[PDB]
Design a protein around this nucleic acid. Sequence first.
DNA 1: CGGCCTACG
DNA 2: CGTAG
DNA 3: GCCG
Length: 326
Amino acid sequence: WMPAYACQRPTPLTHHNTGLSEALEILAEAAGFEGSEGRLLTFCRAASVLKALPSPVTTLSQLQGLPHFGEHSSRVVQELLEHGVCEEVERVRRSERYQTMKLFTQIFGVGVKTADRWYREGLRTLDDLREQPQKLTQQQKAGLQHHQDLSTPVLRSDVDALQQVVEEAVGQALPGATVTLTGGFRRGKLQGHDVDFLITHPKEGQEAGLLPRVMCRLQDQGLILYHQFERSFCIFRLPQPGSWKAVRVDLVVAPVSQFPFALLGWTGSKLFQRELRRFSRKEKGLWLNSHGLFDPEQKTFFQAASEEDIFRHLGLEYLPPEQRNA
DNA sequence: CGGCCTACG
DNA sequence: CGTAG
DNA sequence: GCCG
Ligand SMILES: [Cl-]
Ligand SMILES: [Mg+2]
Ligand code: NA
Ligand code: NA
């Protein structure tokens, strides 16, 4: 009664197993910091299964037959049900390695590989990194300067204000172009740590060259604190009462023929999209990305006019964005 | 055992 | 290497 | 870590 891929079941934003899923996600995150992508995936998938259940897990028996629950994930749940805490999870949380890898990987421009090297060199705090700016890229410098602001989530009201400024710039860059809110806010989140916009134009081809024109206009308005094409990873000035704060904004352009695929990809969740691409290839023999859906036997691309089309192509029941919170 | 999403900057 | 979801 |  629980399908094995996250894209085969609705997953709402809020659910009935929050504590259990959060603990499994700690172990997933820690597996990522050690470079164990397989373990990360399993713990992420197990957490997601609990998010999709219709009521709380209260007894170990209720895990029987659920996909992605084996000896390890079941033991974690069992300990939480019996004692309210899982010793393995708590040991991770307190560990110097987990806490430092988490802090460093939060920096825009720092991934697991860079964080781990710094950890191995003995660095532990943000002020440690500031004292040696010779080891920092310009991107990492911006990420470190703006880290505090970027650590606080923004509200949907902020997002709506940002969308108006983006729409103004896009309208001058290319009249008729449109701006769509994607990412977690499209899935229903009321607050989140970045904001994502997808830009297209109804006349195929007109969007060529658009992103540089948009960026120049936003820069000219004084709104761009940092930027580096079709994807732009920016830090924007967001107005706040009497002041402002830095916010991470991603801008993406797609031709209208690809828009459904780009909308689907950029709406997430990350696990949902990895699972959907895995399902596509392994179960359907079709190759999915944010540009299209390829049949490698006929050597053809599916045309889609909507996300609904893509779900139909793949033989999946349609899930609205609010149900893609895997 | 092999596999684990698939791109762009 | 980083980024995205 | 789990699935097929
Ligand atoms: Cl692994
Ligand atoms: Mg986002
Ligand atoms: Na980072
Ligand atoms: Na983003």
